[PDB]
Write a protein that binds this ligand. Structure first.
Ligand SMILES: CCC[C@H]1N(C(=O)c2cnccc2C(F)(F)F)CCC[C@@]1(Oc1csc(C(F)(F)F)c1)C(=O)N1CCN(c2ccccc2OCCO)CC1
Length: 96
């Protein structure tokens, strides 16, 4: 019933975030929070959404990531903010 681990919470991304994750090789409909962070990472890296000079800043004002997170840019170091933005794009599910 209860996840391991917060990072092992099972989630079902909402349609647009699911679309985003599947665009970078994610084959699932249910993910752990760790997996969502991993695939978002694949997305940022393949689409080169980071600042070449300041790699901790993601620039996403003209990308689906920006539309879903609701920000033009954000710092990868601000975990609290990033979790808030991800949570709005998913639903928590049970381990069955
Ligand atoms: C450090 C090496 C791996 C990371 N990485 C880079 O930092 C990077 C490397 N070179 C150039 C530019 C970048 C980057 F733009 F992203 F900053 C490359 C992609 C994967 C990479 O970053 C991201 C994945 S999701 C993501 C976000 F929030 F923007 F959407 C960013 C990554 O896996 N982590 C691990 C997860 N972590 C994190 C973020 C938010 C909340 C909690 C978190 O961790 C808690 C433990 O799980 C961020 C770092």
């Amino acid at each position: 019933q209860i996840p391991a681990s917060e990072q092992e919470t099972l989630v079902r991304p909402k349609p647009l975030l699911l679309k985003l994750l599947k665009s970078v090789g994610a084959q699932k409909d249910t993910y752990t929070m760790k997996e969502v962070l991993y695939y978002l990472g694949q997305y940022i890296m393949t689409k080169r959404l980071y600042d070449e000079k300041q790699q901790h800043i993601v620039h996403c004002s003209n990308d689906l990531l920006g539309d879903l997170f609701g920000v033009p840019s954000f710092s990868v170091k601000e975990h609290r903010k990033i979790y808030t933005m991800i949570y709005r794009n998913l639903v928590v599910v049970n381990q069955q």
